[model samples]
Target: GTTLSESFENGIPASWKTIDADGDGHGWKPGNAPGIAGYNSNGCVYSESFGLGGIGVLTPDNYLITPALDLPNGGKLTFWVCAQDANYASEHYAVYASSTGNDASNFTNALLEETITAKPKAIRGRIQGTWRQKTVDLPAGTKYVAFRHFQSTDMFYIDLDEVEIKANG
Candidate 1:
């Protein structure tokens, strides 16, 4: 039941390091908020507006080999997301899973598509107390996991909360 609980809130966890945002070979801001808690250029925050971006850290350059936590091959990773759309005020949220290790190679080839969709989008009050949950079954060699907020044209805001990972048992 190994899990890294510092994936949300603010800042990067000490267990997972940062990956290149431009898909380069090196990490730019190893551990810090790139969007959400701060601000982004493309209006893509992960918490409330633009999606946040940061690479987790276990040992800086060693993502798959986190310091004290190991994502089980047969474990479950779950989290809640809230999204808001600009212009039309439509909300779109989704869950993503990746077999990559948050590295340059995997970071570019990892899974980053929508797993859920909301019709007409959900507004702030319309989604109050409502949470979308997604479960991912880890593969035999899952290295790292990531969550991104996919938008629909307009500027969008999303929230990620209560991320948990447990063994499938």
Candidate 2:
């Protein structure tokens, strides 16, 4: 079993570097760029969601996977994120893990990228922003985790916090 973690509290997370490139067989890389769409709270894509508590889409382009975690057998990850709204959509937040990570020679970053809905919502609403917690299980060879939107059609703004990774017992 292997684990990796990071925090974007400093500022907008644009890219990252990897420590395990090969030998480790983790299939994980270093340089990653999470996707961001829209404006703060009023644009078409609304880079930020307010009514629905916003969203964050993660991908393998963002991390370095350990080869040990290649097989899928009840492997899961636990993390937390939040939106910067007062009263976001009631229990309308969700997280997702995908099979999409990186492409071939993309250094073992072999994730196909799919959306898995979270049952227990992990979102919080504050005067400034909203936040949420989540735990997602990975599929056979999944190398990336993303914030899956699970709310009404409305868009909003949100912030992520205390994101951690853990293996399912």
Candidate 3:
């Protein structure tokens, strides 16, 4: 069974928390721009950062965190993500777990220690690419999961959708 799920179909979520450490004002948004849409539906979440108008060389500290969850059984977590310009400028992000709370300081351990680059080779455009699914195995007693778009040089925008956590088999 699915333990937790969110599609962000109703605009900016009230339960979810966000932090823009760099204060660039482009931390997380309810959805993409005018023509962009979510993976599963018309609503989703995105984080865009273009600190100095340069690509891949600019750094940002942004966090799009989930609401608190209790995965006592430790299951599988999956979400859909996409970059603004995958082939031209990929987005780098790190997944993290926070057992303490939703604050930025609470996220101490990176579930994905190494950042994952969203590089869709088939995509030829520099605007957007097809959505890709990302999965992670959660341990028992895990409380919260956060997606951080930090410490990288690349695309300015990233879209996330269909966040779901399922029970272990």
Q: Model 1, stretches more than 4 Å misplaced?
A: 6-11, 18-72, 85-100, 107-112, 115-130, 150-152
Estimate the TM-score of every prediction. 0.51, 0.42, 0.80
Candidate number with greatest lDDT? 3
Task: lDDT for model 1, please.
Answer: 0.40
Q: What is the C-alpha lDDT profile of model 1 across 117-152, one tens digit per residue?
A: 443785554432233555666554555565532233
Model 2, position 133: C-alpha lDDT score: 48
- Compare the candidates by TM-score and give the number of the best one: 3
TM-score of 1: 0.51
Backbone clashes for every candidate come to 17, 42, 2
The sequence of per-residue lDDT tens digits that candidate 3 reaches over residues 1-169 is 2378888787667777889988766677787445558885888887665533443344668888877777767778889887755553466778888767888888887776444354445645445667878789887767888888887654466678888988773
Q: Determine which window of 10 residues in candidate 1 has minimal summed lDDT.
A: 56-65
lDDT of 2 by residue, 3-25 (tens): 65554434323443232222222
* Model 3 TM-score, all chains together: 0.80
